Amino acid sequence: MSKVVPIASLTPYQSKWTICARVTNKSQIRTWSNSRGEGKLFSLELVDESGEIRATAFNEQVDKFFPLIEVNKVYYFSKGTLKIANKQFTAVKNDYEMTFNNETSVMPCEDDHHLPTVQFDFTGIDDLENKSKDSLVDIIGICKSYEDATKITVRSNNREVAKRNIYLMDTSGKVVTATLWGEDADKFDGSRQPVLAIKGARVSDFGGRSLSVLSSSTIIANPDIPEAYKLRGWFDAEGQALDGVS
Amino acid sequence: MSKVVPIASLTPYQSKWTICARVTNKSQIRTWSNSRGEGKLFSLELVDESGEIRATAFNEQVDKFFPLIEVNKVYYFSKGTLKIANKQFTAVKNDYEMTFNNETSVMPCVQFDFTGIDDLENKSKDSLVDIIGICKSYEDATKITVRSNNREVAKRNIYLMDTSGKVVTATLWGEDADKFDGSRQPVLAIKGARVSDFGGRSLSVLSSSTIIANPDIPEAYKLRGWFDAEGQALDGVS
């Protein structure tokens, strides 16, 4: 049954395909009526290692699949059609969208195949130097070292906020400073040298190039992802590597 | 370091060259004596896509490269000397033969179709598969002998495991059995072992087989790292 192929390789009019993906999001059933009558639909956003794709099931397939598909699980999806996407209605970047037909099947999986839990589009650390200030990025690297947190308070009131710098490195030997605030800064645990995947960080040139972890950014620690393994694994092997700013 | 040219394109008094090829043959060290004293040399056969060529290294160079060239590997050979070949001492097709001097340098440089350890119960007996797995443990080696004479071969079982969480027993014999080094939990990339059912489902590392330890490839780093984060909880043998 592993004739599965990557989401990012689906093009319209493709012979046939079957993908392995985690459902990261699912809408509620949508209903509409027009001169022709009523209709209903729901959408999912599927994720695998290579990418992401938004999918929609209409009328009958709503009845069938709505109840059979829960949020963070993994499933084998096969046969559906693909078309150019309506990017004005989604943040998914994929050039195409998948729509279910009445010969579309969805099979639950035993394990998660080490599929990510959110969509990550990683800019290797060595490529951060190319991104313009203020641009968003998803990165992943191992912790080279970390500073202690500082409590920054406003003298007038009781507002106060932890700030903290950490330093990551991937297999390219390059390091970036990532800045953490509030909850993230406080909670950091540099124990056992963790791999951090960071989604939606912002590149800052303020005070020197770096990456700011916004409230809106997401940080996953040691996700069970092949990239996280490649890193950790490469550290053990050749993690006696010195370092390199930027 | 990729200014290399096909072995077949080489000629003597050539401008300058570098080649990438497999030492498909190394002779031992040949010693000789005349009235200028002792002297040694050792030759090699070198093949590439274009063709093949015999190379010789004398005295000092032997000392240097003898240890550095492993029979079935691959290398970056540069700037030796080429002459019309003495075809009566070799079967190498080439019109020319290569020879090494102190201004000659050799720096290092297979491919497998991996079958997941968890999908070997899908392979059938005596079929030839390639696996990659991190060592889970090893036994010490046992010297199997022949009472009759002075023949003896080492035998040792090692145990591999990939992310599937499954564990295969691989059997090593002779040289392979004798130098297996369990230190630092190595990753082993075995090409061409034999699925075998004799004493249970296991892998047989034959002479025809070849083992790369801690390859410099993506599935290897992946394995070591996964073992760190989830290579404590274990087993699920056969």
Side-chain angles (χ1 to χ4, degrees), chain B residues 97-113:
Chain B
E97 164 161 28
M98 177 194 305
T99 158
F100 303 167
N101 46 47
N102 45 52
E103 64 111 14
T104 268
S105 72
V106 175
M107 71 177 77
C109 161
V110 200
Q111 172 158 51
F112 356 61
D113 189 51

Side-chain angles (χ1 to χ4, degrees), chain B residues 110-123:
Chain B
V110 200
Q111 172 158 51
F112 356 61
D113 189 51
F114 290 145
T115 306
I117 292 173
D118 52 289
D119 282 326
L120 276 167
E121 84 176 304
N122 296 337
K123 279 295 165 180

Side-chain angles (χ1 to χ4, degrees), chain A residues 127-158:
Chain A
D127 289 316
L128 282 182
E129 67 164 12
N130 303 323
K131 300 276 179 171
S132 20
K133 92 136 305 146
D134 303 317
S135 65
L136 296 195
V137 306
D138 290 350
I139 74 143
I140 176 166
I142 198 168
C143 191
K144 188 203 75 56
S145 48
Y146 67 99
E147 312 183 314
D148 268 339
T150 302
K151 190 238 290 178
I152 303 155
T153 310
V154 187
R155 185 192 296 164
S156 179
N157 31 266
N158 306 326

Side-chain angles (χ1 to χ4, degrees), chain A residues 114 224 226-227 229-234 236-238, chain B residues 163 216 218 220-226 228-230:
Chain A
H114 292 102
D224 299 295
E227 290 105 314
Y229 297 150
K230 187 155 180 187
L231 272 174
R232 143 135 300 121
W234 162 94
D236 300 16
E238 307 178 285
Chain B
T163 58
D216 190 296
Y221 299 106
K222 224 208 42 183
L223 273 174
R224 185 170 299 297
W226 155 100
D228 291 36
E230 287 172 349

Side-chain angles (χ1 to χ4, degrees), chain B residues 21-39:
Chain B
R22 189 204 320 289
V23 185
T24 93
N25 264 298
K26 165 176 173 175
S27 75
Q28 270 303 318
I29 289 180
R30 289 142 178 185
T31 61
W32 48 266
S33 138
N34 65 62
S35 48
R36 280 207 335 299
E38 297 309 291

Side-chain angles (χ1 to χ4, degrees), chain A:
Chain A
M1 179 73 125
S2 281
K3 24 170 185 276
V4 359
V5 88
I7 291 176
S9 76
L10 295 152
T11 50
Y13 297 128
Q14 169 147 319
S15 292
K16 184 209 181 189
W17 46 264
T18 205
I19 52 162
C20 194
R22 194 193 280 293
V23 159
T24 60
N25 291 296
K26 178 197 182 216
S27 71
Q28 275 304 311
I29 298 198
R30 273 130 185 216
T31 65
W32 42 274
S33 69
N34 52 30
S35 89
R36 315 191 332 279
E38 282 261 332
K40 65 200 296 199
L41 61 82
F42 74 118
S43 300
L44 303 164
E45 147 176 346
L46 307 185
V47 132
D48 82 7
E49 191 214 86
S50 67
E52 184 182 42
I53 185 144
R54 168 164 197 294
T56 295
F58 292 87
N59 311 320
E60 282 197 15
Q61 349 285 281
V62 173
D63 281 296
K64 186 177 191 165
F65 306 106
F66 193 72
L68 312 189
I69 307 188
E70 269 173 339
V71 213
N72 304 73
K73 324 290 177 168
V74 163
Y75 303 75
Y76 282 114
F77 296 89
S78 18
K79 301 157 304 169
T81 43
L82 291 260
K83 75 199 184 195
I84 300 298
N86 286 316
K87 301 161 119 175
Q88 65 270 218
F89 302 119
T90 190
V92 178
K93 317 281 188 71
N94 187 314
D95 285 338
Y96 312 106
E97 288 181 58
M98 148 199 321
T99 156
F100 284 19
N101 51 43
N102 55 63
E103 47 166 3
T104 293
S105 59
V106 187
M107 199 174 91
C109 291
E110 164 37 22
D111 69 320
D112 288 348
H113 281 53
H114 292 102
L115 296 185
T117 313
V118 315
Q119 159 57 14
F120 286 109
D121 172 37
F122 298 135
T123 294
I125 295 171
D126 40 304
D127 289 316
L128 282 182
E129 67 164 12
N130 303 323
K131 300 276 179 171
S132 20
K133 92 136 305 146
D134 303 317
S135 65
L136 296 195
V137 306
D138 290 350
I139 74 143
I140 176 166
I142 198 168
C143 191
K144 188 203 75 56
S145 48
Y146 67 99
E147 312 183 314
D148 268 339
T150 302
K151 190 238 290 178
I152 303 155
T153 310
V154 187
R155 185 192 296 164
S156 179
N157 31 266
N158 306 326
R159 288 265 222 172
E160 67 167 3
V161 58
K163 183 177 180 174
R164 164 172 225 139
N165 282 322
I166 63 169
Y167 304 81
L168 313 174
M169 84 175 320
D170 52 32
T171 54
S172 99
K174 300 293 174 62
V175 188
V176 264
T177 291
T179 298
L180 300 183
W181 284 272
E183 236 259 301
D184 309 335
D186 231 69
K187 299 205 309 137
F188 186 75
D189 184 57
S191 287
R192 313 203 298 168
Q193 192 184 30
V195 175
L196 298 187
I198 301 170
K199 176 178 190 38
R202 195 169 53 202
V203 173
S204 169
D205 282 354
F206 199 73
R209 190 90 143 190
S210 55
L211 240 43
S212 277
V213 174
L214 301 159
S215 193
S216 59
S217 322
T218 296
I219 300 174
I220 286 153
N222 296 315
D224 299 295
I225 255 185
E227 290 105 314
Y229 297 150
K230 187 155 180 187
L231 272 174
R232 143 135 300 121
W234 162 94
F235 202 74
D236 300 16
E238 307 178 285
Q240 274 193 290
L242 294 59
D243 46 312
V245 197
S246 260

Side-chain angles (χ1 to χ4, degrees), chain B residues 4-168:
Chain B
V4 323
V5 71
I7 271 179
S9 66
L10 321 162
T11 41
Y13 297 121
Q14 186 185 76
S15 337
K16 190 302 178 192
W17 57 266
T18 108
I19 65 173
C20 186
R22 189 204 320 289
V23 185
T24 93
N25 264 298
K26 165 176 173 175
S27 75
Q28 270 303 318
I29 289 180
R30 289 142 178 185
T31 61
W32 48 266
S33 138
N34 65 62
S35 48
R36 280 207 335 299
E38 297 309 291
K40 63 182 82 199
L41 64 90
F42 77 81
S43 342
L44 302 175
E45 183 169 323
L46 304 186
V47 187
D48 91 322
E49 201 76 289
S50 49
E52 38 164 18
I53 200 186
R54 187 174 191 272
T56 312
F58 298 64
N59 320 292
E60 297 87 285
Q61 335 295 320
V62 162
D63 290 355
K64 184 180 189 168
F65 302 90
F66 196 45
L68 323 195
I69 302 191
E70 260 206 5
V71 203
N72 185 187
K73 283 312 148 206
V74 177
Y75 303 88
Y76 280 100
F77 309 93
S78 190
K79 345 171 191 187
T81 29
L82 301 202
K83 75 185 167 188
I84 285 294
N86 301 300
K87 290 176 189 275
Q88 65 271 217
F89 301 120
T90 199
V92 167
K93 293 299 180 67
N94 220 311
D95 274 341
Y96 314 96
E97 164 161 28
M98 177 194 305
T99 158
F100 303 167
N101 46 47
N102 45 52
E103 64 111 14
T104 268
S105 72
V106 175
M107 71 177 77
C109 161
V110 200
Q111 172 158 51
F112 356 61
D113 189 51
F114 290 145
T115 306
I117 292 173
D118 52 289
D119 282 326
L120 276 167
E121 84 176 304
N122 296 337
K123 279 295 165 180
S124 45
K125 304 208 314 75
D126 313 307
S127 61
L128 292 217
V129 310
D130 300 9
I131 50 162
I132 186 164
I134 190 160
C135 184
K136 190 163 138 53
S137 66
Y138 57 87
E139 309 175 332
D140 288 316
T142 286
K143 286 191 210 145
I144 289 178
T145 58
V146 187
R147 200 140 91 196
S148 321
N149 66 276
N150 302 311
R151 282 296 271 175
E152 72 177 3
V153 52
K155 190 176 162 162
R156 163 199 236 129
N157 282 334
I158 54 168
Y159 296 95
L160 310 155
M161 182 193 223
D162 58 15
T163 58
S164 93
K166 300 299 158 308
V167 181
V168 238

